Design an enzyme around this catalytic site. Structure first.
Site, PDB file in Angstrom:
ATOM      1  N   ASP A 113       0.824  -1.217   0.000  1.00 38.57           N
ATOM      2  CA  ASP A 113       0.000   0.000   0.000  1.00 38.57           C
ATOM      3  C   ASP A 113       0.859   1.268   0.000  1.00 38.57           C
ATOM      4  OD1 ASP A 113      -2.536  -1.296  -0.002  1.00 38.57           O
ATOM      5  OD2 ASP A 113      -3.170  -0.410   1.885  1.00 38.57           O
ATOM      6  N   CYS A 117      -2.537   0.684 -13.490  1.00 37.62           N
ATOM      7  CA  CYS A 117      -2.575   0.680 -12.040  1.00 37.62           C
ATOM      8  C   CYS A 117      -3.714   1.616 -11.660  1.00 37.62           C
ATOM      9  CB  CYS A 117      -1.211   1.064 -11.492  1.00 37.62           C
ATOM     10  SG  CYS A 117      -0.399   2.548 -12.296  1.00 37.62           S
ATOM     11  N   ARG A 121       3.408   2.545 -10.968  1.00 31.74           N
ATOM     12  CA  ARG A 121       3.670   1.105 -11.171  1.00 31.74           C
ATOM     13  C   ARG A 121       3.672   0.716 -12.653  1.00 31.74           C
ATOM     14  NH1 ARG A 121      -0.504  -0.941  -6.380  1.00 31.74           N
ATOM     15  NH2 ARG A 121       0.195   0.647  -4.861  1.00 31.74           N
ATOM     16  N   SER A 122       2.724   1.251 -13.428  1.00 31.25           N
ATOM     17  CA  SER A 122       2.652   0.920 -14.853  1.00 31.25           C
ATOM     18  C   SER A 122       3.926   1.342 -15.574  1.00 31.25           C
ATOM     19  CB  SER A 122       1.433   1.590 -15.497  1.00 31.25           C
ATOM     20  OG  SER A 122       0.191   1.048 -15.039  1.00 31.25           O
ATOM     21  N   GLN A 137       6.544   7.849 -10.570  1.00 35.59           N
ATOM     22  CA  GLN A 137       5.929   8.915  -9.762  1.00 35.59           C
ATOM     23  C   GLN A 137       6.768   9.386  -8.572  1.00 35.59           C
ATOM     24  OE1 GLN A 137       2.058   6.668  -9.164  1.00 35.59           O
ATOM     25  NE2 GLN A 137       1.194   8.720  -9.385  1.00 35.59           N
TER      26      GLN A 137
END
Ligand code: JHV
Length: 283
Positions: free
Chosen positions: A181, A215, A221-222, A262
């Protein structure tokens, strides 16, 4: 510089934030006028994440062709990817329309439906064989065929039917279920194992349309997934694998979708994944 020793040099000097900010400063800025039209407000999950006009995927519809999705076309590596946001309640039908129209074989999902106590994307595929889903706005039917649950990821076989033509296709759903998370994984080993499973399925290969990867926003994440895949492919193709420059590859990818990777922690994790992955390819 090479990658593994550039890596240790940034760790020892603690300068990951400065490296990452340089990337943000040098990244391309292109218009995203279609994304910001008022009629498309409820088609975007986040107001600051939009596809560029020049690389956006168009739905084959005359009313409204907009979806928050981008074609990343890597010329030297000879790989293409579609990066998109997690579907919204009002865009699940658009999502499967895109999968159909672009002839994709596989969908890669890097988030859970609920994280941090909030919904990160719609429940957009069926959970039981006998309870299929119908998307009336785009005239598609989706059936769960089989499901294989492993410790770090789940693979599902799905049937997508175009109800207008009665054509059917088999779609593979690759669901990475263990990204934390907060932060990034401690080791890249399970992420790399997952990438190799997607590769082995054929979903990334030229005989199919581009893989669809998402994502929650479709950039973090992508971005890590396609950056690692492309860098490892280039290391196999070139005479000198140490010439592969992960920062240059990331800036190339950012010509096609804003914001890929990110955080500085995601940047460091991408380096770690490529470094460890390059040893397994050979040993
Ligand atoms: N490791 C390595 C280093 C250099 Cl300088 C040249 C060739 C190899 N071998 C390769 C090349 C390309 N793909 C896989 C292995």
């Amino acid at each position: 510089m090479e990658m593994e020793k550039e890596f240790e040099q940034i760790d020892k000097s603690g300068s990951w934030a400065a490296i990452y900010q340089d990337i943000r400063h040098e990244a391309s800025d292109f218009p995203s006028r279609v994304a910001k039209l008022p009629k498309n407000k409820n088609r975007n999950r986040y107001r600051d994440v939009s596809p560029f006009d020049h690389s956006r995927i168009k739905l084959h519809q005359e009313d409204n062709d907009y979806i928050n999705a981008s074609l990343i076309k890597m010329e030297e590596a000879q790989r293409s990817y579609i990066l998109t946001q997690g579907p919204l309640p009002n865009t699940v039908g658009h999502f499967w329309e895109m999968v159909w129209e672009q002839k994709s074989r596989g969908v890669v999902m890097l988030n859970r439906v609920m994280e941090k106590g909030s919904l990160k994307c719609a429940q957009y595929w069926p959970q039981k064989e006998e309870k299929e889903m119908i998307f009336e706005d785009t005239n598609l039917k989706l059936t769960l065929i089989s499901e294989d649950i492993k410790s770090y990821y789940t693979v599902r076989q799905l049937e997508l039917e175009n109800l207008t033509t009665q054509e059917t296709r088999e779609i593979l759903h690759f669901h990475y279920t263990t990204w934390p998370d907060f932060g990034v994984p401690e080791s890249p080993a399970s992420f790399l194992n997952f990438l190799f499973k997607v590769r082995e399925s054929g979903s990334l290969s030229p005989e199919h349309g581009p893989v669809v990867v998402h994502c929650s926003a479709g950039i973090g994440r992508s971005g890590t997934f396609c950056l690692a895949d492309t860098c490892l492919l280039l290391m196999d193709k070139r005479k000198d694998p140490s010439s592969v420059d992960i920062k240059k590859v990331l800036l190339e990818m950012r010509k096609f979708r804003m914001g890929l990777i990110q955080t500085a922690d995601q940047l460091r994790f991408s380096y770690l994944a490529v470094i460890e992955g390059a040893k397994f390819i050979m040993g």
